[PDB]
Symmetry: D2
Subunit: 393 residues, 4 copies
Amino acid sequence: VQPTPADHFTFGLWTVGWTGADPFGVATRKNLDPVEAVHKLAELGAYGITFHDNDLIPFDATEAEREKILGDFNQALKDTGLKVPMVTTNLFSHPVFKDGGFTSNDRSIRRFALAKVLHNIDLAAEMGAETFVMWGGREGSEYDGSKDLAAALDRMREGVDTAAGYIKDKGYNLRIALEPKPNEPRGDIFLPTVGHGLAFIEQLEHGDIVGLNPETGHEQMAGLNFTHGIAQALWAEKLFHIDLNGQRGIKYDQDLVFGHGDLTSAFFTVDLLENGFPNGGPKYTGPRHFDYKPSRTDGYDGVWDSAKANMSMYLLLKERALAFRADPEVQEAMKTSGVFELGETTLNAGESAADLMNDSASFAGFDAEAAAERNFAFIRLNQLAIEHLLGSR
Amino acid sequence: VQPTPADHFTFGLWTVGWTGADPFGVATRKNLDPVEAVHKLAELGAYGITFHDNDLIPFDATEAEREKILGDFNQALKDTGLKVPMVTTNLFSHPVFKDGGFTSNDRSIRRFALAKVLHNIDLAAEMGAETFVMWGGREGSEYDGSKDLAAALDRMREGVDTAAGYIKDKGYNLRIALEPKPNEPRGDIFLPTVGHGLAFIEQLEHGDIVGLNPETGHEQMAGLNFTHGIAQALWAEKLFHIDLNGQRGIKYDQDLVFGHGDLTSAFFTVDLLENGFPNGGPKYTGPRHFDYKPSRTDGYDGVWDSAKANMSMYLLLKERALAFRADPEVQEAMKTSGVFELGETTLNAGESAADLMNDSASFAGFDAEAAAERNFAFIRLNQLAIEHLLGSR
Amino acid sequence: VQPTPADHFTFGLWTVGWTGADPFGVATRKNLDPVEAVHKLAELGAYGITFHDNDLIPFDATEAEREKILGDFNQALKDTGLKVPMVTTNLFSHPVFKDGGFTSNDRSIRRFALAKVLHNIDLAAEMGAETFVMWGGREGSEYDGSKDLAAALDRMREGVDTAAGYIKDKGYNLRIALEPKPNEPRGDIFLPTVGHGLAFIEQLEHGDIVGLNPETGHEQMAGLNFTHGIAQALWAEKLFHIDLNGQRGIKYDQDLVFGHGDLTSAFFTVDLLENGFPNGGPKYTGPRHFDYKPSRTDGYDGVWDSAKANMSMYLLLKERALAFRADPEVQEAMKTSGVFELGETTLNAGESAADLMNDSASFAGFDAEAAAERNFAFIRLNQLAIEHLLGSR
Amino acid sequence: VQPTPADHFTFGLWTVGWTGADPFGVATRKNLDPVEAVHKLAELGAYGITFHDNDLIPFDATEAEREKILGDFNQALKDTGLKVPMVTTNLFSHPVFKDGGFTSNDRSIRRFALAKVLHNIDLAAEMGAETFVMWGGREGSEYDGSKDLAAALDRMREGVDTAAGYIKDKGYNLRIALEPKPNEPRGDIFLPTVGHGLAFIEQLEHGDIVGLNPETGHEQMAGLNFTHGIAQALWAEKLFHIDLNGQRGIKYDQDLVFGHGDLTSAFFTVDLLENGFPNGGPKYTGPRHFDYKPSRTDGYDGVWDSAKANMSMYLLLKERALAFRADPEVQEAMKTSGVFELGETTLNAGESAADLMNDSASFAGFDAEAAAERNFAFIRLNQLAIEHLLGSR
Ligand SMILES: [Zn+2]
Ligand SMILES: [Zn+2]
Ligand SMILES: [Zn+2]
Ligand SMILES: [Zn+2]
Ligand SMILES: [Zn+2]
Ligand SMILES: [Zn+2]
Ligand SMILES: [Zn+2]
Ligand SMILES: [Zn+2]
């Protein structure tokens, strides 16, 4: 397994550049030069790089400074051929954002936040990005009376719809991807799961260019099944981008390497990205992006190790996932279990409610006890999947 | 605090009639006669009663049997004056439903399930119910390859839209309320939280008469904030019914008395039901329904005790919640914290994206460090809330 | 694969005999005859079978039925060669144990529960069981004031010390093993984790013959590291038995097949049982017992499928865990990371606290900043275990 | 309210001095001078202050700065009367402790960590602290093969037994108290709960002077009952100190004010510290320490607000918990439910295991079905605690 740019593996600057500072300690690694991030990742097999405005350009940078930094970064990009498919904004690190950007209680903060996003849409568009991700990490509260909850959503809506109107007006080839997280840094974050993100989008004036950016560890922090959540996002055609990593349980955001958390769940996500749905349906085509953090115990040899571990893990899972579905035994098991019968509509062509209620065979004389005897054999289909995952098959 | 029918407290037959059978043991109480459930609840202060088709009418009941049971129940209702505001279907107890009703892999089961719902819509409508609740408790899986996930949602949609077309066609004054649960009895249940329910509704052909039935312990089983979740349901105008109870943590569905779980969260839910949003917004008006189970350690004196504890808890919380918002000190704290500033739109009337980006004051010359100095004083507003909850104020 | 009697795969009667009644439904399978259970198990390659008193002998059986049932049971054991390595008592299904057995608030139920155990101790000895397990499933509460928490631990101590004392008194060659569970069926169960169980054994009079029976799923219900918890049980020399199964997350006790829950943790669990510790130390040499339940969606073909899969999964994992430790690149990765170095004592032979008093070479003249650059390379080390697990290396 | 020095409210320097840097952001508050910290605390009514070595004396400070800093510190203590009841060491912020202190894989870092502790023991004695706390925050791993799990417990034992042995050697009037935490900053921390900590102390050489320092939030991060866990610590006679705070759910360590997390559990926690056990037994008589952190959204007015609220909340709860136990209806509800009956021994004075051997009056002729009808009335009993807590009774 060796990644090629054809694989479409993307990494954030903040991922391999994460310096190690956590809540109980200081950084354990020196800052990463962006030029070096670009060059290193291009030699590993990366397709592209992604960043937050302040990963690159300091908050306080003068114009001369900004210009140099950008000339350095664009240079690096030209030299290596790396694409910039997604750009995001930092609305969580400066003290000004302690109560949120878009949903701050303070109105002047709300406007600075939105100003900071619009300017960043411009940059994103100069960089050639197709996706604009929003992670509202400071939107929310520790306490239940701190917010007017209906007003928190109107403020959110105002922000996101102003950003979208501006894309439409400028003619930029950008789509917005919202990224859910249930908690941390706030005790409760607004629009905590894929479900809440998808709902909110339907109340937006310009929701057609607004979709999701689910992260594997984020949905697992609320104990949900990542594979089910992206399946609903795909089903509604709102899966615009995806962040892969690992999480080992309901706790702080670990941001481990993809496959370093729940393995079987990783296998099944790769099967859904690569094979689509058993009966047909939309398929995901964008970047396979890694929003992870190299453990702080490791030095720089560890950082490029981890980066490479992400693309390896994925490729290994993919090989198993493709062998899994190509196995005849696995296809037989699938049929037995009624994985293909689920895809047939319940009603017959032009049969209505009334006609169904009246079909005697379907209700009044249905032999419920007899139908209850089917052996779905779900245990056996899961066993076959694990056996292909362990490559013992 | 004494409940009156004006309070709109509703109870399910299955709640006070829960016999005690759990996964590790048999029933500890004798079955409850429905006539007696009706009469008892009317003397406690209940407004109405609710049930599942098989709580009342056995699965296997002959027509003579069904007719008697219904004559007994309707009698009881006439005598006491109890209303039947919601009716639901049991698609989880018979063995036939082991893989789901609507999303079973087996197609004949899917049709029986839907047949069983349509017939039940008829009954619901004869009983005078305004709400038809669906709890898809067996829809989902233990294993990730057991389902074609896109096909699971199409099947769900087919069922729910056939039920809704039939209401519209019959002219019945019914609305469908979906009820989320993340897990149990299945390892993962489809449409696990309020978020996922609200999303799904937007893909329905007839989603205008389809809304939610959130349960306090269900959202807490995924660790979310119940108060935030119903605030998004209210904001989208999709809060059709609500199930109140208590849950003490992420574990099995406890179904404790309302207030017997997370107290502060209960206080804040009552504040949202009773006071609405601080800046104005939709308000909830339906039944205040209790879907709880009297602990199995208690005998029948315990059952009516628990029933009464539900309405008491709520009334006590309500008195505190109304005193809380009426306190001048609390209103001052609210202003200070910017609870009312959140309600002012970010942009000025007819100010666009472009005009905002260009306002110098809003971005280029915004003094971020200075704005970061505001003391939101959220700790102090939470302290005042707790002090009103403990009635020490 | 191919399990053989020397593998020491023991299975309980309640596992394959689990008919499928959960909280929201009735059994989906017909009762399993015990003689049938013995023959099928033996033919799959099991070494032994375990049971709860009431699993074999009805709570109501007369003396005449006890001996008839035992007759056929002993004959089957005889005809097949299964051993009976562990026995346990049912102190949770009958409504009389609704507040517990040993810690029941009612004294006459405490006596009845203790009496039931004493007699089950005589049957255990009779069968040749080396271990007598205690799962206190109903010891706990839903409410914090339901119990005197000190007296609940005094009544638990009394029961376990009376039973232990009776084993010593009759000279049975039996050990007691407590089985922790954090909740379900009680809201909170006493001695909820391995730690708590371990701590508790140290306050008994007859502690010497009391140890633990940790279960994968149950520590995973508190979000804990199952391998870390068994390590501590083993390190303490209290790992008397083990229950293997699968759990996906903090939720109800799933009791899935071993390997169908957290797969990487199962990998490392098998590594500790089979290889023990990297530097040398204690080893677990008792039986590998499966405490699981066949999914209720599947017929009897799933039941025997599910029992074979337990066994397969443990041997596939065993295989990959033997190749992993044997691999010279892993052994070297291990050396780089300091695994063997953790094995050296901190203090030099003869060094005192004053001597070291941090020595400086160890304190004053120590270069903290230089020691901090060490790359532990834990990420690379984790990547080698996963490729070994995926069958890749 | 009105806290006074006899209340024994102790606060750490890092709590009110917590500037607000979390994982996604920088500090939102200016550094708090220690002399200032002492004066403000004393004027609020605190009895004492606790600190980590590096909280007061920089990791780099020279000998000359240590003594200057200690000079002013002792003077402030002097001028105000605060005592210094507990001292602890920082073994987690400096990058050198990235794999731990005592269980670091690197031997030279194990020595450096132990040396740091030994010297901090001499400062503790000097200050008059009675307790020396140990929070092993970096002892653990992200990955299961990063450690030899047996050697990690041997290296932890070595460190605590060397430190204890040195206390005994110098004749300091000091006790060691371990502080459990299940995770964060490590993915898995060793001795993650009260049980584990308790079990671990029993394998030490110098166990007699080692006990625990449980923290509300930290057992709540594993979903456990904090009152149940302190009960067991107390019952074991190992409850040497206590850390009080608030946590809403399984997520990152929130460190909220005591009472702003699980309010009913806080109620019952205060009932156990203040009233002890219903039937009589051990009592906790040390200090009431607050290990919390003022929300980062709030300025310095919130910091002193948040410190007063800890104290208020504990006295409001204390008040309601004294009225609850004193209430004659509660005392009678208690009798009905069997709380006093749990206090009686199971066996009669002189009864042997053979004698009882279940006696029958206790086994054979026992009417299990009749004993099962007992109404324990735990629901009514819970309803009386909540109305006592809501200020209603
Ligand atoms: Zn992400
Ligand atoms: Zn993340
Ligand atoms: Zn409900
Ligand atoms: Zn429920
Ligand atoms: Zn279990
Ligand atoms: Zn078990
Ligand atoms: Zn903490
Ligand atoms: Zn603490």
